[PDB]
Amino acid sequence: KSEIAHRFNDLGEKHFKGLVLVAFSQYLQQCPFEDHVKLVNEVTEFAKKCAADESAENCDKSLHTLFGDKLCTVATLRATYGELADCCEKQEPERNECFLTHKDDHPNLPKLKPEPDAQCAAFQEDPDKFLGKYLYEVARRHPYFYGPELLFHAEEYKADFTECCPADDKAGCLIPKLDALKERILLSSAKERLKCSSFQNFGERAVKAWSVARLSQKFPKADFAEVSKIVTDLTKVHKECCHGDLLECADDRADLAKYICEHQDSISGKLKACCDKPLLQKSHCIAEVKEDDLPSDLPALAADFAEDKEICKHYKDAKDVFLGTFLYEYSRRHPDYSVSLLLRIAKTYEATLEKCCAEADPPACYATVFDQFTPLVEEPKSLVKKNCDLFEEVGEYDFQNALIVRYTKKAPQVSTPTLVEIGRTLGKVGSRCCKLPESERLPCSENHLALALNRLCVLHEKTPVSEKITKCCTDSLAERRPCFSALELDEGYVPKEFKAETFTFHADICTLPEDEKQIKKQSALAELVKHKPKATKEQLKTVLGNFSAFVAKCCGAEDKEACFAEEGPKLVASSQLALA
Template sequence: MKAATLTILLLTLFSSHAMHRGRDYMRDKVCGEFKSLGKDKFRAGAIIASSRKYSNATFEEILNVVSEIVSIAEKCCPEGADPECYEKESLALSNRSCSDPSPFPKHSGIAGCCLAEGLERKLCLAALKHPAREIPVYVEPSFPEACNAFQNDPQGFQDRYLYEYSRDYSSAPLPVVAASAMNYVSMVAGCCQTGGNRFCFLSQKFLRRPLVMLTLMSNKMCAHYELLGKEKTKLGYIIKFAQKSPNANFQDVLALATDASEMVSRSCSDTFNSTFEAELSEHTTKICNTLSTKDERFRDCCKCCDSTNKMRAYFCIYSLQWTSSPPQLPDFQKPSDEDLCNENRTQAKEHYFFEIARRYTHAPEALFTAIYESSENIVSSCCSDSDPTACFALKRPKAREQIFDLLEKGNELCSQYTNLQFTEFKEKLRENYRKMIPNSAEDVVSGLVEQRSSFASTCCLLNAPPVYCGLKVKSGVSHTCSHDICLLH
């Protein structure tokens, strides 16, 4: 399915921005795609776009939406159709969304939208979107299961797969998700219609692996950007590069982090063409040119980096974990009060976190992010104070011990998780808790061990899920770090 197909569907059927361009624009675009694609491909695109937008909706709710969309196109797009048909039917659709009960996806914002009328109601409903799933949960069926389901009901199999796959990757660029989802459906159809050859299935799965990895990776990168925004996304890349390659210099890391954040800001909202892979390949070249001489692990990943294997090189770089032996680095100069309050304060803070990250190479990124967010509040408060110097003098000393205590603990926990077998890691936790709380009952200790090991197994990884780990870190930090303490020291 062409990327442009889903572009039109997304912009015209689900976007409030398209509605502002006028009803004739929307009708012409929808009808143009419906006529050029035909009903089946148009419907498939609607399932993908709807499932991405309403990732928490049931399968039946998505099919209800899709049925309405296709029905409007069938009724309003033929030659000679009433020019007012599209406007009337789309308005009726928004009204049915406000009925009680409604057969369409539920959303907490629907009640507010339904207080409005006409175009304002349609704009409000079009802007609604379910939160993206942070961790994919759908497991693709085995070869026999896929063939049995496809042969029993080809249309039902395709609909269900497009729904499940698209809702799992709703943060990835639309063209990437569409290409991967339709590629899988084509693979199953081709292999199962030729006698169900297992070798066909396995070989095609191997060939589609780069597309699967691109979808998974772009979904993570775009979800991170969607959650944190451009500035904190750049900070996240600074931390990742510093922890993976602590021998790199700040200006090189800053340039790469800036390039990465610019790339995702452009590509993640891409709906017209699939530029993500091309931009990622270009970014990979910059990484290899910059860091191959600083770190042999980057050099090994980049060896495969010819014109056809840039994506494989990036997969390798993306999968690198923390450096196993961080270098011994001298003390560094902390930012002054003036550095934090002048117009270049962003780079001063970025440099500060770079220096911390290359020294605490196993501390989870979510911990850095929590510290950064609290730091921003205090810096903003002191810089706007009538006496910034006195404000910082009062607050910065309080932060020193708490911040580095948190970093030490986070670094130690994740270092142990990384370097020990999981059973050894849990036993080490148990020993530590017994020393810390010697009079506690065994079930209390066991509960703490399970809680901490669960956090480590998910968040002691580079590229860990930011929402889940951020909430866990903030919950833990709140016990030891007050709102006034978590700031740059």
């Protein structure tokens, strides 16, 4: 009878409110925390009233009609959300589409600083207000965040403040936990944003293609019907989360985790650990599980996909199924490839059949189809080897700067804080992936790139500035990284006017932590490239090294400001000469 009641019964009071908190935070990102808790409570109260009397007035309304309605009751809508008010004129699902469109990928809120004893204080005072604040903060900063997974992280967050607040040294145990948690939030948010961007830009078939490749790798011992079934369910789960259908999304998630754990013996040996765990941890561990060992009975593949005389008929008869099988098969045996790579291979396979099967002797034509995969494989392998050598030689910061030069050359219209955030995330991929066993480096690298590039496409959606960026972001999901790789120096670009103040430094910088000092330098670097786009990376490395030296000297000076003031302008002009 009543959807609200149903979700309520299923989910429980705790998680139900949790996800309603997240839903709302993600929808209306600028509302005070208070205004959200009261909305959650109100809706939760209605839910209880429905759970007890499902016939009751309005209980039978859809979830979206009910949330939409509550979000439209919110204080100062037109002033606070001028765009959002128009959404309230509209009924469901129109209304919801409207909220979604008008969600903010870059709200640039205050950085979350963990003040350990001020928050340990608030935590003891009221643990529930404390954790719910964290859900709010995190949800509004990452409005497409995997909702269920946030509740999970919010629990780790509890366990941090639980195991650190009584401990005599607060900061020392707390600050690195919280920093690690933030690393994890950011990565998680980027995996999920890539999921939702794919639904929105490429659709369901593309998301399933991605899932089939990835789960085939993760569960190489599960047979095709089983991979199919999981992917079908998983896709549905992320589709609902991506449309803000969070309650529905959590319930389907629980069911799918129950399912996978019923069947774990025909899915993967690695699940055991995850199945002996409480609900949220189990879902998390399934989500993050490592690839199983490859089975000894993997079938040769030449027979079915290359030598068989009937391939065109099967391909013509059941396209998505045939290809699906191929992809399952090629991916089970290739944990050593990025999902992108597998998807590219699958397209070249499809494209070999369309070609061959319209010809005279198709079997003579498709007999060599495996051999077309070779150049697809070597190109990323090189990328990863070459960029890992560089990284191993010069370390994160230099590697980041190399990437900032690269990106600013390709898209000098993008704003400096974007190119710096990107270049930096891209170099963190070095840190993450290059250290790994060699056969692991390609998938780590390209899987991680897909996240940063998608983060770029997302920003570029809001603030479009380069056609070269639009084309890469919109032509093909599987071709994105290669399309990006291939951009050179935009030569239609007109160097940005020189503004000396931008390269002029002051004593303020000296009191910054290392992370932040780099950011200011790295920003100058982008700006150096904007003004001198034909300067080589080597030339810029030397200029910036000149800049670092000067910042370090003046920071260690008696009179930091006079040092900056005397030396800075000479360095600013002479450095222009170094970038011819």
